[PDB]
Amino acid sequence: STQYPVVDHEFDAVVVGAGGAGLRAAFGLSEAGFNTACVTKLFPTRSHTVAAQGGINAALGNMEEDNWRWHFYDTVKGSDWLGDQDAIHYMTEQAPASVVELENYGMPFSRTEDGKIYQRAFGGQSLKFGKGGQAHRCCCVADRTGHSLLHTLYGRSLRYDTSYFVEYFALDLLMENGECRGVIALCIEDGSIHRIRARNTVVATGGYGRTYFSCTSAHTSTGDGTAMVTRAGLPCQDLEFVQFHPTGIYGAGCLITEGCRGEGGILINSQGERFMERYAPVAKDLASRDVVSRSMTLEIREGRGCGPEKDHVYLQLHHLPPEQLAVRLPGISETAMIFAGVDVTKEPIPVLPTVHYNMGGIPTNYKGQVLRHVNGQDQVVPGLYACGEAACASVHGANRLGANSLLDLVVFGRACALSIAESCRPGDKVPSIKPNAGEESVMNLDKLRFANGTIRTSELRLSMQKSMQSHAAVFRVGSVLQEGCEKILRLYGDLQHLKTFDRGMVWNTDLVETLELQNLMLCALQTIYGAEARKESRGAHAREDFKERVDEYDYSKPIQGQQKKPFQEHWRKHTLSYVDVKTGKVSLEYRPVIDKTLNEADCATVPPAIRSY
Amino acid sequence: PRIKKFAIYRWDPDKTGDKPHMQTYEIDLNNCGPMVLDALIKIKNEIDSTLTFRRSCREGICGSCAMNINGGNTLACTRRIDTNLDKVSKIYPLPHMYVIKDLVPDLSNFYAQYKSIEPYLKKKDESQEGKQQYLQSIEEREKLDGLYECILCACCSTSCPSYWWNGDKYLGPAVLMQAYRWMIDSRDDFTEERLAKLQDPFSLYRCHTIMNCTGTCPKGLNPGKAIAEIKKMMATYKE
Amino acid sequence: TTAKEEMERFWNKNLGSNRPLSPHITIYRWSLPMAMSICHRGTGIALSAGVSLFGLSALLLPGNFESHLELVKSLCLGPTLIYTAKFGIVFPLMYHTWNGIRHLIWDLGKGLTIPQLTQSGVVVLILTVLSSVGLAAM
Amino acid sequence: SSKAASLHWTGERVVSVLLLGLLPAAYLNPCSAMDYSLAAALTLHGHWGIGQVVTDYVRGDALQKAAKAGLLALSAFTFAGLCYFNYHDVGICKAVAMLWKL
Ligand SMILES: *Cc1cc2c(cc1C)nc1c(=O)[nH]c(=O)nc-1n2C[C@H](O)[C@H](O)[C@H](O)COP(=O)(O)OP(=O)(O)OC[C@H]1O[C@@H](n2cnc3c(N)ncnc32)[C@H](O)[C@@H]1O
Ligand code: HEM
Ligand SMILES: CC(C)NC(=O)c1ccccc1I
Ligand code: SF4
Ligand code: F3S
Ligand code: FES
């Protein structure tokens, strides 16, 4: 107050994030006729979806004949039955419809002989409910899929009159009596604070990949909206589930796509054996994104590493046709030469299992509404929506199937715009906020700007990142996870000892990294505490001590003479985590998985079963 | 130990009448990444956290780390440092742009030019969109190769002398390439009226083929080629 | 906000501020095609000023062209100085003529790659020297 | 759509190829008829050349007028000066011949 120029803006809807989901929501609201604002710390193009390489999943069936219901089955099979089947229904239903939308927007999709969109093999896909074979349903723009996606989404976004607050760091949500009223954001350009108030708020800030030392994600993937929800007292779903992508360059930790394995890429250990025969003989090296990476990490265990350090594994493209690599995978051909210093068509690529996607996030239904947990039941948080990687409608569940998140972006981003347009009309009076609101966020900014401590922003970041990379790895034991807990918890108390250098208003990257650090910590405590409490092997989260699947029934034997286990005895439930901001204490309760689909007659519910792909 | 010297452009707007000046930084390359951005991150995270620069993907596809390295506009995460310690690496912001702070240029004009060319697919029958995928042949898809990859890093236009002298009225190679990108696209019908917008001496014709645009591209694209290809379409299009 | 409304607020902010411009030619590394394009303007400005000083002198100065050469002949002819003055006339001419073809080749679209610029760039530079020496003595 | 700046680019290039085909033609066939065509094409190309130098560097409204009006004055006085030189004197073709033979 009085120290910072407070400028209040009046809008119908606010969308925080300018990724794939953020954009689709933003102009999708202005399409319905809403006065929409969009808050983003980066420039729209310079988000992350740009880094997307594999492709967008759609059951169009341009290669072979395809049904969208088979795409539903593999998503829920890949989710290890923690995936909410009602949200998976809606996403796989809109799958072909929403991609044809993007092609008509201007996306330069690769083509075949018939002139239709090029679909290609990807990990986890199958025809005829996992009986037919390998399905080709990954629509791609030749290794630069998300790049051209975001540009065409941004291209279309200039058709409508949307107020884009470009390079504005949102700190917290404007919240009053459980009702959402907008966001309080800092302008990066001059340092002035803006209290942007609106009737509806859509959160699409993306994931928190930078919680670990080695990640494929960007420097600006810090899970800010996930921590924004955290501070507001609202829960966060399935945060312990962290996607370890099998194929990531040994050097900087960059991503070479799973589409490499789809075209004909092979994974080879030091001795020469194609190790993806000892583990997954059914679906070769094109198995689930968790099973492949977990097989790689177990190959290092024996001492069969492929380098001078004996730590990484090789991905070979030595046998692939010369022009097939240049046409289908031109982006990886250049990034492997730039970073790893490796010719793709002559040598194998040094790859290692690294952090990729964040399965969890803000609790959400299929409509896009943010859910809270009241009396063991689900309650809609008014005026608050979430979509994309930042959200967790659990359309991915325990394990995300490859190339599904771009669908998750466009489908659920579109859903949020429709859920608002059908909720109210553009012109419904904006709920006024008290003049003292955002006080705890402005004071946090002022306290963090002048912060004189013992350890600096970078020292605490490396302390968190290396600890998460050592403790909450691919394999995790109740011994190391418990040790990692009070190791992370202590670092939250270290936030009082923060050393800042810059005291300027205009572009303080030293301050906003620290703002990112506070946000990264909240998405680090819930990741480690949720993992230590969960005692089973499901999807990405595989326990050494608890190597079994703990469901309501033992689904190996027929379901008849079996007593149903009570809710607090099986781990087939969503891990909802809260945290008191002052002490850093993490308390956690649970939400039941959604099994019933949107329509049983149109799409049948898939019962849990053993999954070794 | 292998200590490398870095000369970096610095201007702090919160310093009351501060003039822009260079600053030297001492960095050991043994415990440092191969790229310039890794070195910029290192001094940010160790030596001086007052250095303010744009970063994101460290992959060379977002275009945030755009700057002038040793007299050439490239991406910092793509360009690797010269191991020759006898030379000092000079790091400047994108040439002839209003500096906000230390290597951060104001690109509000650059983006607005990209907004003026309308980088979206336009049809005459927009009533039938969003239900049936538009057909495009493999060769018609090849017409977009080496054009759609543009990251909009702005290394392009900022290397052009015409964009220095007339950045206000001249669009620049980055923007002009995208305008061309939406001309040869077989799905776009508004080809003639896209060429109609450039019918003034400044929008397009301020290019004199200096060729500093192509010579500097981080993605290995050829923007100038497209500009001279527009000029051909401009003189030949009927009505 | 519209397309050209962002441009207005860009100029109404930056021009009325203490924001300094990043250095341009002060720091940018000299490349051959760049420096060759500067010379093509330089030879253009020099030649146009040459022709302008030729036509204006025909209207302002008394006497015919023959008598204007009789004062050049009066000042005892330079041994190799006559070759030097003749050299510094075809040298700016032939450079501009040869590079003028190269600029015209670029208008058709052919030869716009980076390797071809340094290739045809040297060719123009060499054909300048070969038609400056081998033209002044004709 | 009315293309005016497009013709100015094309019309300049047609003058360029005409001037390129005049220099060897003036050497091989030096006459009075070659003198007027060369003078016209030489002063046209030069005018459109400086016209580009003006539009690239001359910033302003009042300055843009004066630089274009001032250039037009020089261009018209150069073409008239050469046409006077072609008519009531040796001409351009003979002038170079007498300058070289010295
Ligand atoms: C990491 C990654 C992910 C990825 C991929 C490759 C990499 C390296 N390739 C994919 C692929 O080929 N196919 C696919 O289906 N998915 C792929 N992924 C996963 C997925 O695409 C990404 O997770 C995706 O980019 C997420 O998109 P989303 O729109 O949800 O989030 P974002 O793209 O990261 O955009 C973030 C935006 O939010 C704004 N932001 C963030 N914090 C703030 C604050 N503090 N204040 C204001 N704005 C904020 C940023 O501005 C940014 O624009
Ligand atoms: C027959 C030989 C010549 C050829 C082939 C030629 C060709 C060209 C071309 C194509 C250009 C445009 C460059 C571009 O921007 O792409 C140019 C520029 C120019 N020329 Fe010539 N020219 C010739 C002789 C002359 C002469 C004798 C003069 C003197 C009156 C002259 C004066 C100029 C000027 C002032 C420019 C402007 C520079 C620019 O805009 O880049 N040229 N020349
Ligand atoms: C390189 C800079 C200083 N010189 C120019 O400005 C320039 C040179 C030749 C052609 C067009 C131009 I706009
Ligand atoms: S065309 Fe190349 S140099 Fe120009 S903005 Fe795009 S990536 Fe940068
Ligand atoms: S640097 Fe230049 S003037 Fe044209 S050829 Fe490239 S835009
Ligand atoms: S940071 Fe993405 S291009 Fe350098």
Short mmCIF file of C-alpha atoms and ligand atoms in Angstrom, two decimals, chain B residues 73 75 110 147 149-157 173-175 177-178 213 216-223, ligand 4:
data_model
loop_
_atom_site.label_atom_id
_atom_site.label_comp_id
_atom_site.label_asym_id
_atom_site.label_seq_id
_atom_site.Cartn_x
_atom_site.Cartn_y
_atom_site.Cartn_z
CA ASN B 73 22.86 -12.11 -33.57
CA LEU B 75 20.79 -17.71 -29.60
CA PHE B 110 8.58 -6.26 -33.44
CA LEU B 147 9.64 -21.21 -43.37
CA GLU B 149 10.44 -23.11 -38.27
CA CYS B 150 10.89 -19.38 -37.60
CA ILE B 151 11.10 -18.92 -33.83
CA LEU B 152 10.62 -15.14 -34.04
CA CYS B 153 13.85 -14.65 -32.06
CA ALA B 154 14.21 -11.24 -33.75
CA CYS B 155 17.89 -11.92 -34.53
CA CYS B 156 16.74 -11.53 -38.13
CA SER B 157 15.32 -8.02 -38.34
CA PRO B 173 12.90 -10.14 -42.69
CA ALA B 174 11.46 -12.07 -39.71
CA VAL B 175 7.98 -10.60 -40.24
CA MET B 177 9.14 -14.32 -44.08
CA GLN B 178 5.97 -15.12 -42.11
CA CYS B 213 19.51 -11.69 -42.03
CA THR B 216 22.82 -14.71 -38.74
CA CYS B 217 19.84 -17.11 -38.43
CA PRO B 218 20.12 -19.53 -35.49
CA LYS B 219 17.79 -22.03 -37.20
CA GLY B 220 19.69 -22.06 -40.52
CA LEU B 221 16.77 -20.50 -42.40
CA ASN B 222 16.97 -18.24 -45.45
CA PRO B 223 14.74 -15.16 -44.87
S1 SF4 E 4 13.78 -16.39 -39.60
FE1 SF4 E 4 15.56 -17.16 -38.37
S2 SF4 E 4 16.76 -15.28 -37.81
FE2 SF4 E 4 14.66 -14.60 -38.46
S3 SF4 E 4 13.45 -14.43 -36.51
FE3 SF4 E 4 13.09 -16.52 -37.41
S4 SF4 E 4 14.65 -17.88 -36.39
FE4 SF4 E 4 15.31 -15.70 -36.07
#
